[PDB]
Each structure stands twice: as C-alpha cells, then as structure tokens.
Write a protein that binds this ligand. Structure first.
Ligand code: CDL
Ligand code: CDL
Ligand code: CDL
Ligand code: PC1
Ligand code: PEE
Lengths: 78, 77, 65, 129, 63, 62, 80, 129, 65, 78, 78, 78
C-alpha cells in the first residue's frame, strides 16, 4: 500500500556530501602551487607568467568548487 | 543525447518563462545566465561533433586491431 | 567644434530612463500583489484542510469505535 | 465608388502640382520617369542615415553630458532654456506614469486579498476580462 | 498522440467526451499540455501534484 | 570539411546569395518563435486545466 | 573573417616583393562589382539576388512565419 | 564609471571617423561647426518630406490600382513577383491574427459561461489579473 | 510616367485592411462573449430570487397563519 | 503483503553523491596546470601551444564535471 | 511475517553513486594531458603525434565514464 | 498516506561529512610545503619569493577549509 514519507533531516546529509567535493578542489590548488614553486626554481625568469597561469588554474578549479558549493547551500536551506 | 535533451529543456524553460527580466531591474542576472547558456550550447555541440567522429575512429580501430593481432609479414628477398 | 545649442540626446536618454523606472515601479507593485495572493490562497487551502479534518473527526466520533 | 476615387485622385494631383518646392518636384519627376516610389526612397534614405549616425548620437550625448556637468550650460541660462526644461520635466513625469501603468499591466493598482473590494472582483460580469 | 491522450484522460476517458467540448476548450487544454512540456523538470510541481485542500477534481473524479 | 564558399561579411550581405537568404529566413523563424512562445504561454488569459489533477504522465509511467 | 564557423578563404600570394612592386594596377579594367576591392569585405558592392529584398526583410519573413505557426490555432481552432 | 564612459566615447569616435561617406562626413562637420544636431535634423527633414509626399502616395496608390486592375501587372508576371506576393500574403495573415488578438484583447478566446473551464476562471490565484 | 515597378502603397493599404478586419473579428467575438455572460448573470440572479421566494414560502408555512 | 513506500528527502542524498564527482574533476584540472608550469619552465618558448593543450584538457574535464552536474541538478528537481 | 516492500526513492541513491565513477575518469584525463605537456616540452618535434595518442587515450578513458553514466540514467529513468 | 518525519540526530551526520573536506585541504598544504623544500634546495637564493607563494597557496586552500568548516558548524548548531 502507499506510504509517502517526508523526512526533513535528510537535507543535511546531502549538504555534507556536497562539501566533500571541496577536498578535490583544495588539494587541486596545492598541486598547482606545489609545482609552481618548482617551476620558479627551474626558470626564475618566468616568475610572472607562471604566476598568472597558476592563478588561472586556481580560477578554473575554484569555479568548479563554487558550483559544488551552490548545491551544498541550496539543500541546506531547502 | 540525453545531456543535450536535458540542457535544451532547461534553456527553453528559462528563455520562455524568464526573458521578461530583461525589462526588469534584475536584467543583469538574466543576461549572465543567458550568456552562460549560449556558451554551454556551443560547447556541447562542438564536443558532440568531435566525439562522434572519434568514436567511429575507435570503432574501426578495434576491428583493425583484431585483424592486426594475427597478421604475419614476410620480407622480400 | 562649438558648444551644443541643443541637448536632444541627453533628453532622449532621460526619457528612456524615466519610462524604465516607471516600469520597475509597476513591476515591483505587481510582484508584491502576486506574492500576497499566493499566501492568501495557501491560507485558504490550509483552512479548508483543517475544516475537512474537523468534519472527519466529528464523523469518527459519530462512528464511535 | 469610381467617381469618388477619380475625385480623390484629382484633388491629390492638384495639391501635388500646387506645391512650389523645387526639390520635391524634381524628385517626383525623376521617380515618375523611372517608375519608382519617392516616399519609400525617402524612408530608406532616412533609415540609412540614422544607421550611419548612431555613433554620432553617442558622441553628441557624451559631449552634451560634459557641457552640462562642466556648468557651462547653466552659465548662459535664459528663459528659453527654462521653458525647454519645463517641457522636459513634463515629458519625464508622463513617461514615468505610463511606465508604471505598463509595468503593473493595469490602469489601477491591484486589489489586495485583505481589501474589502475583493467582492468586486468576485462579482465580475465577465470573469474572462 | 500524447496531446490526445492527455485530452482523453483528463476529460472523460473517451473520445466522444472530448468531442463534447468546444474547439476553444480543446485549445486551452492542448496549450496547458504545452506548458507542462516547457516546464518539464524545472516548472512548478503543482501542475500535476494536487496541494492538500485544493477544491479541484482529483484522480477518482470519473471513476 | 568546411573548406570554402560564399561567406557574408555581415548581416546586410546575407541577401547576396540565395542559400544564405534561405538561411537567414530560417534563423528568423528560429529566433522569432521564442518571443511568440513568451507571449502565448505567459498570457494573462491562459488558464491551467481544471482537470490537470485527474491524470498526469507521472502516474502513467510510474 | 568568420561568420560563426564559416571562414572566408584567402588566396595565398604567389609573386615575390620585387616582382610585385613592378606590377601596375589599373582598376579601370576591373569589373564594376570589384572596385576598391577589400579582402575584409569583398562582397560590399555585390548585387542583390532580388532587388529591394533586404536581409532584414527575410529575417522578418521568418519571424512572421513562426508567429503564424504559433498563433494560427488561437484564431482558427479545430476540434479533435 | 568614467573610464568606461571615456572608452565608449573613444570607440564611437573611431567608428564615426572610419566611415568613408562624403555626405555623412560633410553633414557631421557642418553641424559640429554650427553646434547643432545632425540626427535630429535628418529626422525633421524626413518628416517634412513625408508630409509633402502624402498626396504623392495617394496618386501612386491609384496608379498602382489601375495598373493591377488593367491586367498589365499579370502580363509580365515573373518568379520574383511570385516571391514578393508570397511575402505579402504572409504579412497579411500575421496582421490579421494580431488584429484579432488585439480586438478581443486576449491571446486566447474568452470562455463561455456554459463551458466546463469556468472553474479555471473561478480558481484564479490572482483575480486582479 | 512609366508603369510602376513596385506596388508598395497598395500593399500598405492591404496591410491596414487586414489588421482592421482582424480587429473586427476579435471585437465581434468579445461582444458575443459579453452578451452571453450578461445573460448568464441575469439567469443566476433570477434563480437566486426564486430560491429566496421558495425559502420565504416555506418559512410562511412554518409560521402557519 | 505488498507494501509500498516513497521517501521525499532521498533526492538530497543522491544529489550530494554526484557532487563528489567534482572532487576528481577539480583535482584533475589542478594537475594539468601543475604540469603546464613545469613544461613552461622546461621549454619556455612554448608558452602558447602548451596553454592551448591545457585549455583543451580543462574543457574535456569540465565536460565530465558537467555530465555529473546535470544529474546533480536533475535529481534535486525530481 | 512476510512483507513485499517496494521503496521508490532508492533509485536516486544508486544514481549518485554511479556519478562518483566520473571522479576517476575526469582525474585520469587530466593526468594524460599533464604528461602530454611534459612530453611536448621534452621533445616538441613530436607534439602532433603525441597529441593524437592523447586524444586516443582520452577517448578510451572517457568511454568508461559513459558506462557508469548509462547506469545512472537506467536507474534515474526507472 | 501523507506522512512526515523530523529526525533531529541527522544534523550530526552532515557535520561529520563536511569535516572530510579538510582531508584534502590539509593534504594540499603538505604538498605545497613539500615542494617548497625541494624548491629551496635547488634555488636557496629564492627562499623569500617561494615562501611568499607558499603562503599564498596556503591561504587559498584555507579559504576552502573555512567554507567546509562553515557548512559543518551551521549543520551542527541548527
Ligand atoms: C496582447 C499582446 C499581443 C501581441 C501580439 C504580437 C505583437 C507583434 C509581435 C511581432 C509579430 C511579427 C512581426 C509582424 C510585423 C507586421 C508589421 C510590419 O512589419 O509592418 C511593416 C509594413 C510595411 O513593410 P514593407 O512592406 O516591407 O515596407 C516597405 C517599405 O519600408 C515601405 O516604407 P514606407 O515609406 O511606406 O514607410 C511607411 C509605411 C511603414 O510604416 C510602418 O512601418 C508602420 C508601423 C509598422 C508596425 C505596425 C504593426 C501593426 C500591428 C497591428 C496594430 C498595432 C498598433 C500599431 C500602431 C502603429 C502606429 C503608426 O507605412 C505603412 O505601412 C502605412 C500603413 C497604414 C496605411 C494607411 C492607409 C489607410 C487607408 C484607408 C482608406 C479607407 C477607404 C474606405 C472607402 C470605402 C468606400 C465604400 O507595414 C505594415 O504592415 C503596416 C500595418 C499597419 C496596421 C494598422 C492597423 C491599425 C488598426 C486598424 C485601424 C483602426 C483605426 C482606424 C479605423 C478607420 C475606419 C476604416
Ligand atoms: C552578423 C551575424 C548575422 C547572423 C548570423 C547567423 C545567426 C546567429 C544567431 C543570432 C542572430 C541574431 C539575429 C540577427 C541580427 C538581426 C539584427 C540586425 O542586424 O538587423 C540589421 C537591421 C538593418 O539591416 P538592413 O538589412 O540594412 O535593413 C535595411 C532596413 O532595415 C530597411 O529594410 P527594408 O527596406 O526591408 O524595410 C522593410 C520595412 C519593414 O519594417 C518593419 O516591419 C519594422 C519591424 C517592426 C517590428 C516587427 C517585428 C520585429 C522583430 C522582433 C522580434 C525578433 C525576434 C528574434 C530576435 C533574435 C535576436 C537574437 O521597413 C519599414 O517599413 C521601416 C520600419 C518602420 C516601422 C518602425 C516601427 C515598428 C513598430 C512595431 C510594432 C510592433 C511592436 C510590438 C507591440 C505591438 C502592440 C500592438 O537593423 C534593424 O532593422 C534592426 C531593428 C530591430 C532591432 C531589434 C531586433 C531584434 C533583436 C536583434 C538582436 C541581434 C543581436 C546580434 C548581436 C551581434 C553582435 C556581434
Ligand atoms: C494599458 C494601456 C496604457 C496606455 C497609457 C497611455 C498611452 C499613451 C497615450 C498618450 C500620452 C501622452 C503623450 C506622451 C508621449 C510621450 C512619448 C513621446 O512623445 O516621445 C517623443 C520623445 C522625443 O520627443 P522630442 O524630445 O520632442 O524629440 C525632438 C526630436 O524630434 C528628436 O528627434 P530624433 O531624431 O531624436 O528622433 C529619434 C527619437 C524619437 O523617437 C521616438 O519618437 C520614439 C517613439 C516615441 C513614443 C515612445 C513612447 C514611450 C512610452 C512607454 C513605452 C511604450 C512602448 C514604446 C515602443 C517604442 C519602440 C521604438 O528617439 C528617441 O526618442 C530615443 C529614445 C530611446 C533612447 C535610448 C537610449 C538608451 C540608453 C541606455 C544606456 C544605459 C547605460 C547604463 C549604464 C549603467 C552603468 C552602471 O521620445 C521619447 O519620449 C522616447 C521615449 C522612449 C521610452 C522607451 C521605454 C521602453 C521601456 C523601458 C525599457 C525596457 C527594455 C530595455 C531595458 C534595458 C536595461 C536598462
Ligand atoms: C474564386 C477564388 C477565391 C480565392 C480566395 C483565396 C483566399 C485566400 C485566403 C488566405 C489564405 C492563406 C494561406 C496561407 C496561410 C496558412 C496558415 C496556416 O494554415 O497555418 C497553420 C500552420 C500550422 O498548423 P498547425 O496549427 O497544425 O500547427 C500548430 C503546431 N503547434 C500546435 C505545435 C504549435 O502554420 C504554418 O505551418 C505556417 C508556415 C508558414 C506559412 C507561410 C509560408 C511562406 C513561404 C516561406 C518559405 C519560403 C521562404 C524562401 C526564402 C528564401 C528565398 C530565396
Ligand atoms: C499590445 C502590446 C503593447 C506592447 C507594450 C509593452 C510594454 C511592456 C513594458 C513592461 C514589460 C515588462 C513587464 C515585467 C513583468 C512581466 C510579467 C509577465 O510575463 O506577465 C505577462 C506579460 O508578458 C507577456 O505576455 C510578454 C512576455 C515577454 C514578451 C517579449 C516581447 C518580445 C521580445 C523580443 C525578444 C527578441 C530579442 C531582443 C533582444 C533585446 C534584449 C537583449 C502577463 O501575465 P501576468 O498577468 O503577469 O500573469 C500570467 C500568468 N498566468
């Protein structure tokens, strides 16, 4: 027979999962600054262009992290 | 094709039922969303065009690999 | 290039801006009214549900199980 | 049905012949010789010019904004400018009101659900309108 | 086919019942079906989920 | 393979080749069908079906 | 130039600079369609297929066809 | 807020300088020297010409009606005329539909009192609209 | 005065006439609907009057004079 | 017996899981740019071709993340 | 007792789990291009050839994600 | 039937999951302060610039860490 159930607390669980993705982002960041330093040591003359490309790396990875965070916040308030 | 259908449905929805925001004070949000949708539209179409040809290439490559695994070549003397 | 003897273009832009601001006023008013009516309809449905529940409760008491 | 048409054509022909503008008559004669339409040609020329003058309009707008902001406009202020500004203000007010009416898509403000005038809405003769 | 199915199911469950309506009414019904199509997964869910307390006919209306 | 052919420089040149004339006609149809849907499906007098809760595809496919 | 993904082909030069400098240009021999020829706009003076038929007119024709397609049933509805 | 304005003005100035139309440049120079507006002058010239060409339009209408009625138009009928007539028919249909919608002041036909859709009107979320 | 190469003015008049005829169609439709609704409201009021009269008659019988 | 149950909040759970698919996407983008820097340090004259290939890699990885995000938003609205 | 229970929302959960597969696929693709850069800066004369192989790798690696995605659809539309 | 439940304890579970987002974050920092050392040995003359870039990367990762921490605390005291 039919039983429709609306469990309110579940929206917390999913929110937490949406935050786990942030790890794959944050680690992502370090990698870019893990290698940037090495590059600056290998070719110190390009300390500027490499910095800009890493910042672009941060932007693209960071953008993926806000897309996940939007799902995290939407389910926390709904 | 599932992805294309779903994105097209979303674009139709927002385009038809939220274009009036162009005349409203939140027009900038709609313009940002619309530009993002256009970018996503072009990107999806390019990706599908490339993927179809590449998948045909691999389909034929598998068969040719089967054939090549059992071919033996003699040397002319 | 002498100073402009007329300000037609500024006046045209101002006309557009005035009409746009009026449109925004009207849109805000209409949106507020729509939200009010949505809330009113929700309250009406809730009252109808409560009335139906009360009627069912009275019928249950009449059933007397 | 035919006499009236002939009379109207004759009247318009007389009026067309009456005007003493050299340019208008010259254009009419040229288009009649070529069999083309002068009015449509005028419309196309106008739209072409306006298409080519859009950025001129933008430049003029910025020049006028600088002229007003610099205070030079108010230095030579006269009564004629006051008349023009009053006209400008009147148009602004009327445009704002029309914009409000179009924005709410109603001449009158909408009725709130808690108002006692809701009965009027319920007792509409034609609910479609 | 989908449009005709919606018209038949929502207005009697038979073709004759639908034909009992006028062309204008059928136009309204078909355009509502179009609305549902355009909403799809993003429109409001009250177009097919009856809120509690709603006075409109339910699923057992014609049964 | 996208190798060559007539390529209009701007909108005004689409009328210099019959194929691009048909193309711009089709583009007009494509882009102009959206405003029509905005007007038609956001109309004041558009009313939801009273019997929309009698049946839905959701119950059918379920 | 480009129109979406359609790129205008460009002819590769074949003459060297020395030979090219000795060439005398005489546009009087050129066709009227191509005078003051511009690689960035070679069809500016090209004739219209139909006289008086603008690109905007065709675009508007398509828009009107779409409006008819969506609004005809609103004025002349038909029964199932 | 000021850098953007300067950039827009510079871009429009470049585009205005780019155009190689002798008449447009001459008019722009003359109006800049006199301090007047070229675009507004173009609009006034256009409206004056159209005011002076109204009876020319009437005469042309009667001439075209005679040309069509006499059968001379169909004698030289070509495919281009067919294309134009198809365009004309399409515009007529669209205008008729728009006229109907405006005449009844509703996109959809109004609901009759005996229709079963009256419930929809009664259950409007916002009776004001 | 050569024959006209274009029929712009006739086409413009035809455009106006087409729009006008559409307007007339819509106006006729709306007027008919309004008349129908006026008659419906009149019938509703008449039914309400008859119901009130019947209620008054029953109350009169209960009064039993 | 023939019991049947429908639960409302479960779509918050699955959605969150799909968001975790953006953890490896994020990371991955990271990695590309990391290597890019080193490459630009090893062969500094190739600052544009390497940038183009990095953009291509980001585009493909973003397509995968987008494939996942479609599910994440779709279950959240079902 | 003996109850034949049918829960409806579970198809969301499984669907989300399938999306987690992409977390690998995405990452894997990045790795390829990473090495590609390090391979183009180590022997640029082969760039074109290398690019081709990378594309082949991308097409093989992506294939796997699709499998997972298919399952999601199957459970999401059933 | 129409049924609705409110399981309070779930607000803990989500708070835990968000904490896992730090797992990558912390790891990311390590990667930075790993390569930094390898970068400082090769070019000890550039310790200052490399140290500044490492601090920048640490701050960028800490941003994501604080995002996850904010989510966790909100789901904990709610
Ligand atoms: C609720 C929301 C609903 C929304 C619905 C959707 C809304 C629209 C969305 C978009 C839809 C798709 C696009 C469709 C576009 C269609 C329009 C279009 O393209 O137009 C261009 C088109 C010309 O294009 P073209 O052929 O390429 O032109 C080539 C050259 O450029 C030619 O250049 P030119 O130099 O010729 O330029 C001038 C030209 C161009 O001018 C324009 O462009 C005009 C404006 C264009 C837009 C018009 C839209 C019309 C829509 C319906 C009405 C809405 C209000 C419009 C207000 C207009 C104000 C000016 O002027 C005209 O067109 C003149 C037209 C009027 C002719 C007047 C002649 C009357 C003679 C009467 C004699 C009677 C004698 C009876 C004797 C009987 C004896 C027994 O012009 C028209 O179609 C004109 C239509 C005018 C209709 C007016 C109807 C008014 C209502 C009826 C009258 C009621 C009062 C009077 C009653 C009197 C008693 C009888
Ligand atoms: C480069 C890329 C190209 C495309 C690539 C492929 C596609 C890619 C996808 C995207 C494509 C975008 C769309 C194509 C571009 C269209 C615009 C254009 O360039 O037109 C040039 C065109 C001039 O080109 P032309 O070939 O030299 O034309 C010569 C003359 O026009 C003279 O022409 P004629 O000799 O044939 O004259 C015919 C006749 C015919 O004239 C007319 O009929 C005038 C039109 C009247 C309005 C009718 C409908 C208008 C359409 C609106 C809906 C459009 C929906 C689709 C738009 C999508 C945009 C994305 O004219 C007249 O008689 C004079 C008109 C006097 C009447 C004025 C008053 C009108 C009142 C209207 C009343 C109705 C209003 C509604 C309420 C009514 C309530 C009762 O400029 C205009 O005419 C523009 C006026 C309208 C502007 C807004 C139009 C909609 C929005 C367009 C946005 C486009 C964005 C592009 C971004 C690019 C960034 C890089
Ligand atoms: C429900 C029924 C309700 C019925 C209510 C009653 C209805 C009315 C009954 C009668 C009432 C009494 C009479 C009142 C008449 C008032 C109108 C009048 O006389 O006009 C002549 C007057 C010029 O007369 P004048 O000063 O003697 O001219 C001297 C020369 O003849 C000058 O000659 P010209 O050569 O200059 O000729 C061209 C001139 C003349 O053209 C015309 O005559 C135009 C048509 C005239 C009638 C307009 C009526 C407007 C009524 C409201 C809207 C209804 C729809 C109108 C459709 C028009 C289509 C073209 O063009 C203009 O006027 C251009 C105006 C537009 C300027 C565009 C500039 C935009 C810049 C934006 C920059 C933003 C940057 C932001 C950066 C921020 C950074 C942080 O022009 C106007 O007033 C223009 C008003 C335009 C308002 C448009 C508003 C549209 C809605 C808002 C925008 C929403 C979409 C876009 C949003 C974008 C996001 C921001
Ligand atoms: C004695 C003799 C008497 C003669 C009297 C003659 C009276 C004539 C009266 C007017 C007739 C008009 C007929 C045409 C209009 C028909 C409208 C209609 O049925 O619409 C319904 C149909 C739609 O039917 P529908 O209503 O089933 O579709 C609705 C579909 N949904 C519900 C999904 C939205 O409309 C159309 O299909 C319109 C298509 C466009 C029509 C115009 C075509 C013009 C040509 C364009 C192509 C060529 C472009 C070339 C460009 C490039 C050139 C190089
Ligand atoms: C006879 C027509 C006269 C035309 C005058 C128009 C004036 C309008 C000025 C204000 C417009 C903005 C209003 C903001 C609120 C609109 C809300 C809305 O959608 O309401 C619709 C009105 O909206 C419409 O019908 C039209 C929607 C949008 C139409 C678009 C017109 C054509 C646009 C062409 C776009 C092509 C590309 C141009 C690009 C330019 C910008 C980049 C009516 O329904 P409601 O009573 O609110 O309730 C309905 C629910 N049962």
């Amino acid at each position: 027979s039919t039983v429709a159930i609306s469990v309110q607390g579940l929206h917390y669980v999913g929110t937490g999962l949406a935050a786990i993705a942030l790890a794959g982002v944050g680690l992502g960041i370090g990698t870019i600054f893990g290698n940037l330093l090495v590059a600056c040591a290998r070719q110190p003359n390009l300390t500027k262009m490499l910095f800009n490309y890493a910042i672009l790396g941060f932007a693209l990875t960071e953008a993926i992290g806000l897309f996940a965070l939007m799902l995290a916040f939407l389910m926390l308030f709904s | 094709h599932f992805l294309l259908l779903m994105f097209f449905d979303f674009f139709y929805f927002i385009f038809v039922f939220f274009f009036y925001g162009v005349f409203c004070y939140w027009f900038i949000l709609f313009i940002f969303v619309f530009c993002f949708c256009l970018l996503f539209y072009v990107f999806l179409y390019l990706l599908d065009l490339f993927a179809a040809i590449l998948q045909l290439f691999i389909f034929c490559n598998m068969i040719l690999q089967l054939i090549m695994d059992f071919l033996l070549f003699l040397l002319f003397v | 290039k002498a100073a402009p003897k007329t300000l037609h273009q500024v006046r045209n832009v101002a006309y557009f801006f005035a009409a746009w601001l009026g449109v925004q006023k009207g849109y805000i008013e209409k949106s507020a009214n729509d939200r009010l009516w949505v809330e009113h309809q929700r309250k009406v449905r809730q009252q109808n549900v409560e009335r139906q529940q009360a009627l069912d409760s009275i019928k249950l008491m009449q059933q007397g199980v | 049905l035919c006499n009236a048409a002939s009379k109207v054509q004759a009247r318009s022909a007389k009026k067309l012949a009456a005007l003493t503008d050299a340019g208008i008559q010259k254009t009419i004669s040229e288009h009649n010789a070529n069999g083309t339409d002068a009015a449509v040609s005028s419309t196309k020329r106008y739209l072409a010019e306006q298409r080519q003058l859009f950025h001129y309009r933008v430049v003029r707008f910025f020049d006028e904004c600088h002229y007003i902001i610099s205070g030079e406009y108010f230095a030579q202020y006269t009564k004629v400018n006051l008349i023009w500004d009053l006209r400008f203000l009147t148009k602004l007010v009327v445009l704002f009101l029309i914009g409000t009416v179009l924005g709410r898509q109603s001449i009158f403000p909408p009725i709130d659900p808690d108002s006692p005038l809701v009965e009027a809405l319920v007792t509409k003769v034609n609910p479609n309108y | 086919d989908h449009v005709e199915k919606a018209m038949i199911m929502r207005w009697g469950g038979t073709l004759e019942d639908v034909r009992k309506l006028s062309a204008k009414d059928q136009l309204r019904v078909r355009c509502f079906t179009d609305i549902e199509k355009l909403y799809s997964a993003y429109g409001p869910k009250d177009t097919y989920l009856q809120p509690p307390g709603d006075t409109l006919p339910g699923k057992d209306f014609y049964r | 393979m996208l190798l060559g052919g007539f390529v209009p420089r701007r909108f005004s040149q689409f009328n210099r080749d019959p194929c691009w004339m048909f193309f711009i006609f089709s583009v007009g149809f494509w882009l102009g069908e959206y405003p029509a849907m905005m007007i038609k499906y956001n109309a004041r007098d558009l009313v939801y079906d009273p019997h929309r809760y009698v049946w839905s595809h959701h119950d059918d496919h379920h | 130039y480009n129109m979406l993904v359609f790129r205008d082909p460009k002819r590769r030069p074949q003459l060297s600079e020395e030979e090219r400098a000795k060439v005398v240009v005489n546009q009087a021999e050129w066709p009227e369609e191509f005078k003051d020829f511009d690689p960035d706009d070679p069809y500016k003076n090209s004739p219209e297929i139909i006289k008086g038929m603008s690109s905007w007119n065709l675009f508007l024709w398509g828009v009107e066809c779409a409006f008819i397609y969506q609004f005809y049933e609103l004025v002349f509805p038909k029964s199932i």
